[PDB]
Amino acid sequence: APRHGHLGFLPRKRAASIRARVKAFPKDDRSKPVALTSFLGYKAGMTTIVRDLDRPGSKFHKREVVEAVTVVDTPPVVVVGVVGYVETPRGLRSLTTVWAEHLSDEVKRRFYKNWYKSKKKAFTKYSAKYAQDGAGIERELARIKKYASVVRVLVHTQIRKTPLAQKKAHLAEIQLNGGSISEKVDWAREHFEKTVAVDSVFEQNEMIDAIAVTKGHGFEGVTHRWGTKKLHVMWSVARAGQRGYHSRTSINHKIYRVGKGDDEANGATSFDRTKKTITPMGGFVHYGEIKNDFIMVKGCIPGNRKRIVTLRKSLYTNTSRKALEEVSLKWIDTASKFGKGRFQTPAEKHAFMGTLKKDL
Amino acid sequence: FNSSIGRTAQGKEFGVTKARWPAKSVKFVQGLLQNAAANAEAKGLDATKLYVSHIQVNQAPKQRRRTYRAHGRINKYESSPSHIELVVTEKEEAKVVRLTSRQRGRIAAQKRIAA
Amino acid sequence: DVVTREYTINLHKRLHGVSFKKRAPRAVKEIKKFAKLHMGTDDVRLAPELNQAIWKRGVKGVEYRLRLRISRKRNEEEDAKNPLFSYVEPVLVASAKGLQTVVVEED
RNA sequence: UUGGCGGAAAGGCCUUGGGUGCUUGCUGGCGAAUUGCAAUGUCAUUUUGCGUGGGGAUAAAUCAUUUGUAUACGACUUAGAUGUACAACGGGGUAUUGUAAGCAGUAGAGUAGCCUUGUUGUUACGAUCUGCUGAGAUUAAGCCUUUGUUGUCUGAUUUGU
RNA sequence: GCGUUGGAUUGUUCACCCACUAAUAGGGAUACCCUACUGAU
RNA sequence: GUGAACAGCCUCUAGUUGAUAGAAUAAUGUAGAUAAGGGAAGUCGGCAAAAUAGAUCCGUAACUUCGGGAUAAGGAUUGGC
RNA sequence: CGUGGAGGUCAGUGACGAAGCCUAGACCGUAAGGUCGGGUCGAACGGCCUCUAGUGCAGAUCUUGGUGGUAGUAGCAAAUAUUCAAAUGAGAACUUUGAAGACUGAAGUGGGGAAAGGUUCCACGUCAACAGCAGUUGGACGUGGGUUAGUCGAUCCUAAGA
RNA sequence: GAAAUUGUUGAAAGGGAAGGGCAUUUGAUCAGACA
């Protein structure tokens, strides 16, 4: 028989941060300009999608087929600083950080943990070190230009630009896949206190990796933890413990849309011709509205709603046809998931119901 | 005496994870602390400087109480009481060398060279 | 700061998924806690008329909403916690909808 | 004091300038006693403290509270000091069911009925039906939204190279 | 490295069929108490 | 009142409101329930759970010690004005 | 070597502190064991030659008594269910009253009896114990009060029977 | 008013063992004789 479990994710404990931390990146290619290797946003809900299908040879070629997607809030993302990393015979070593002369209340509120009692003195000496000349800064920058075979940039989100209310910014580091590390840090230095799209990293007809932390479910025992049957000790004998809130990594994820907040009628295919953003009736379920850019990707990401995720651009040069097919949407369901949704727009609600006692 | 205890955070001041909020012990105890503050005031002592220097507690004789349980047995059931005492005190913000001649002449020579 | 108020309080969103024999008593504590939040005092007193109003539909039949009068007051001597407390008595309506909080004028 | 170099775990290695000494490179003068024949005969270096007189900067965290992306208890994540604030209600949006109390009717099998003896006599009762009625009630407790009203917005503790 | 089935028949392992699938190979190894294991500060 | 009833359910007369309490919903337990589609394949073993069950109309075989088996089986019906 | 007692002996020690006890304070003896100093303590006791015995302990699923871990753990979880204000008092999840909510639902959580129990019945006062929580309450504790017969019954009859 | 056992203070030590033996170090503590 098989074993009622895997063995790879074996120390089934909770992770240490809700930010699932990037561990891998595709290595480099020092011929291109710089391309950001990752991005991050906040998962919001699911929808259903039909899609006409250019899949040569498949049974469903040139047919409509319904599939199911998710959605994530993807505001613009501002850069605040960089770090270098050098190869050793130990591994890698953080040797310098540098920050960007003016920092948001959000990230100042991240590094502090009890905000309002704080004097909010986070970088007041660093901005003073940003002198008339920036001498020490350029000292500790050109160092990295010399050293630091590979380099990362810090980001933070603009979370006030979401329906969510947490007030706090989720830092991260992001690796680059350009060359000319001097050019990398020069590019980033120009990008200091400057923000970046998600259609400026990704596009359609793309595959991604989705790394996040799962929904928690508490201390569920064997019968629902491992799907094991019901009536010294070894470490693979299917004993009860914590489920959920593990980190995971989900790959081979076909994007269909790279949305846009300013673009009205985000739910518009070529077919619908209806001025509706994808935010369906009722708001999202435990998430609010989508008045920003977004992504529509098939399958189902690890997470729960109003949870953060991190994105990576598939980490290698894929080989399957499905990694290269050309997407064409036909219709977005835009109904409320707060019930068995029937109607896309409240004007359609008015139209099919008619006028009512409260209407006049 | 810290077993099968639910843990809670309010001991993190003390650097300890396990803690609990007894009432009865505390009622008797602050009875005593009020008695001792009263007695120090009776002596005519200050309380603003005053700290507990010594507390003490030690077992005491048991009630022989009972209950009745399975297989027809008087299995005992009984107390664990306490003597208590404490002493409170006003805070207060407050040899010759045998040696040898070989060691003596050396230091005398260091003086001799000390100009 | 002697003050009186009206207040609504929504029990359907405070007594969801509860043991039937504790739906009604728990509402008492929820009401006192509501006074503790809004008025900002811990020692609370109630009305047996209001207790009737809560209990009248049994224990597992408590109404989804009520409407209340609250009167923070001074206190008598050496009730050592504070010179103030809170008192709670109901006010009668065919519905507690279309209402909202108000300071009632003084007479 | 000058300019260099070095990131692998650099924390050091050079070099300019002078200042400052000592020179056993050569030759002189003075002193060494007494630890009594030796007794490690104490010379370095780690850390810390109290005092010294001189510069330098004047914060977090935890608890309590609240949320809940988490939840055995702990923990992890959030919010809160005069505002893009936070909350309790209320409105609006979604959905949930399935058409309320209050009445009115020339619907209402029928049976009596005061007699204006009908020729729908009308008056009594009368399951229900028809209309005010997709009406009514509910809606976050682990939904959306808010220019509304009304309140909160300085409580305890601990920490130092 | 990964996999080796659903049934029919006896208290009984002895005995031996039907059909699928790629195959349906053979073997061994009260319990709160301290330990180990699963999880948590 | 109910209904065949002294079953069970509700109530008046009368009497208790006693059974250590509080805050929380993690599993698993203990008692109690529901589950599509198939319908005892599972299992030594229809163990337990579940199925009809009340009242009326028709009807109820073989076998027999003719007395029964027999609430046989099996079909229909059950409200209110 | 040591112990309980006995015959002698040291004109023995002894309130100016015998005996016992404690003591990482000393000395002896290879060792059993002895000796000493300090502290505590308060009235008898020891050295030697001899005697006599109920004479020496790690143990006996030993005996009696006491005390520990386990542990502030298991557990106080059947009996639908309790809630608000006032009084009392220092103190109320629990006593009393009052307003609501429930129940036994008359083959009862009602009112009376037999056997048995024997002051539990009633008041006042009261909590150190008991009421497996607490208690200002109670069948608990202290002090008292109270059981009225020509007709109910026993006694009388005889039953199987002794 | 002993012992198990228990607490407070003082000293010391401590990574899945403790206790004991031979010698010594560190720290505490201590008797004797010099005439």
UniProtKB/Swiss-Prot annotation, chain A:
Glycyl lysine isopeptide (Lys-Gly) (interchain with G-Cter in ubiquitin) crosslink, residue number(s): 32, 129
Phosphothreonine: modified positions: 96
UniProt note: phenotype after gene disruption: A mutant confers resistance to trichodermin, a trichotecene toxin produced by plant-pathogenic fungi.
Subunit relationships: Component of the large ribosomal subunit (LSU). Mature yeast ribosomes consist of a small (40S) and a large (60S) subunit. The 40S small subunit contains 1 molecule of ribosomal RNA (18S rRNA) and 33 different proteins (encoded by 57 genes). The large 60S subunit contains 3 rRNA molecules (25S, 5.8S and 5S rRNA) and 46 different proteins (encoded by 81 genes). uL3 forms together with ES39L one of the contact sites for the signal recognition particle that targets ribosomes to the endoplasmic reticulum membrane.
PROSITE patterns named in the record: RIBOSOMAL_L3
Modified sites of kind Phosphoserine: 17, 149, 270
Function: Component of the ribosome, a large ribonucleoprotein complex responsible for the synthesis of proteins in the cell. The small ribosomal subunit (SSU) binds messenger RNAs (mRNAs) and translates the encoded message by selecting cognate aminoacyl-transfer RNA (tRNA) molecules. The large subunit (LSU) contains the ribosomal catalytic site termed the peptidyl transferase center (PTC), which catalyzes the formation of peptide bonds, thereby polymerizing the amino acids delivered by tRNAs into a polypeptide chain.
Cell compartments where the protein resides: Cytoplasm
InterPro entries in UniProt: L3_arc_euk, Ribosomal_L3_dom_3_arc_sf, Ribosomal_uL3, Ribosomal_uL3_CS, Transl_B-barrel_sf
Domain of life: Eukaryota
Molecular function GO terms recorded: RNA binding; structural constituent of ribosome
Gene3D superfamilies per the UniProt record, alphabetical: 3.30.1430.10, Ribosomal protein L3, domain 3, Translation factors
GO terms classed as biological process: cytoplasmic translation; maintenance of translational fidelity; ribosomal large subunit assembly; rRNA processing; translation; translational elongation
Primary localization: cytoplasm
Extra remark beyond the main annotation: Present with 450 molecules/cell in log phase SD medium.
Protein name (Swiss-Prot/TrEMBL): Large ribosomal subunit protein uL3
A single GO cellular-component term on record: cytosolic large ribosomal subunit
Curated annotation (Swiss-Prot), chain B:
Signal peptide span: none
Molecular functions per Gene Ontology: structural constituent of ribosome
Main location class: cytoplasm
Keyword Ribonucleoprotein: yes
Entry keyword annotation includes Nucleotidyltransferase: no
Biological process according to GO: cleavage in ITS2 between 5.8S rRNA and LSU-rRNA of tricistronic rRNA transcript (SSU-rRNA, 5.8S rRNA, LSU-rRNA); cytoplasmic translation
PTM annotation (Phosphothreonine): residues: 8
GO CC annotation: cytoplasm; cytosol; cytosolic large ribosomal subunit; preribosome, large subunit precursor
Keyword annotations: Cytoplasm, Isopeptide bond, Phosphoprotein, Ribonucleoprotein, Ribosomal protein, Ubl conjugation
Compartment(s) of residence: Cytoplasm
Subunit structure: Component of the large ribosomal subunit (LSU). Mature yeast ribosomes consist of a small (40S) and a large (60S) subunit. The 40S small subunit contains 1 molecule of ribosomal RNA (18S rRNA) and 33 different proteins (encoded by 57 genes). The large 60S subunit contains 3 rRNA molecules (25S, 5.8S and 5S rRNA) and 46 different proteins (encoded by 81 genes). uL22 is associated with the polypeptide exit tunnel.
Family note: Belongs to the universal ribosomal protein uL22 family.
Job description of the protein: Component of the ribosome, a large ribonucleoprotein complex responsible for the synthesis of proteins in the cell. The small ribosomal subunit (SSU) binds messenger RNAs (mRNAs) and translates the encoded message by selecting cognate aminoacyl-transfer RNA (tRNA) molecules. The large subunit (LSU) contains the ribosomal catalytic site termed the peptidyl transferase center (PTC), which catalyzes the formation of peptide bonds, thereby polymerizing the amino acids delivered by tRNAs into a polypeptide chain.
More info: There are 2 genes for uL22 in yeast.
Protein's recorded name: Large ribosomal subunit protein uL22A
Taxonomic source organism: Saccharomyces cerevisiae (strain ATCC 204508 / S288c) (Baker's yeast)
Gene transcribed to yield this protein: RPL17A
From Swiss-Prot, chain C:
Anything else known: There are 2 genes for eL31 in yeast.
Name assigned to this protein: Large ribosomal subunit protein eL31A
Annotated signal sequence range: none
GO biological process: one example: regulation of translational fidelity
Subcellular location: Cytoplasm
Role of this protein: Component of the ribosome, a large ribonucleoprotein complex responsible for the synthesis of proteins in the cell. The small ribosomal subunit (SSU) binds messenger RNAs (mRNAs) and translates the encoded message by selecting cognate aminoacyl-transfer RNA (tRNA) molecules. The large subunit (LSU) contains the ribosomal catalytic site termed the peptidyl transferase center (PTC), which catalyzes the formation of peptide bonds, thereby polymerizing the amino acids delivered by tRNAs into a polypeptide chain.
Family membership: Belongs to the eukaryotic ribosomal protein eL31 family.
Cellular component annotations (GO), alphabetically ordered: cytosol; cytosolic large ribosomal subunit
Keywords tagged on the record: Cytoplasm, Ribonucleoprotein, Ribosomal protein
Chief subcellular location: cytoplasm
GO MF, one annotated term: structural constituent of ribosome
Organism: Saccharomyces cerevisiae (strain ATCC 204508 / S288c) (Baker's yeast)
Subunit structure: Component of the large ribosomal subunit (LSU). Mature yeast ribosomes consist of a small (40S) and a large (60S) subunit. The 40S small subunit contains 1 molecule of ribosomal RNA (18S rRNA) and 33 different proteins (encoded by 57 genes). The large 60S subunit contains 3 rRNA molecules (25S, 5.8S and 5S rRNA) and 46 different proteins (encoded by 81 genes).
Keyword Ribonucleoprotein among UniProt keywords: yes
Entry annotated with the keyword Transcription: no
InterPro entries: Ribosomal_eL31, Ribosomal_eL31_CS, Ribosomal_eL31_dom_sf
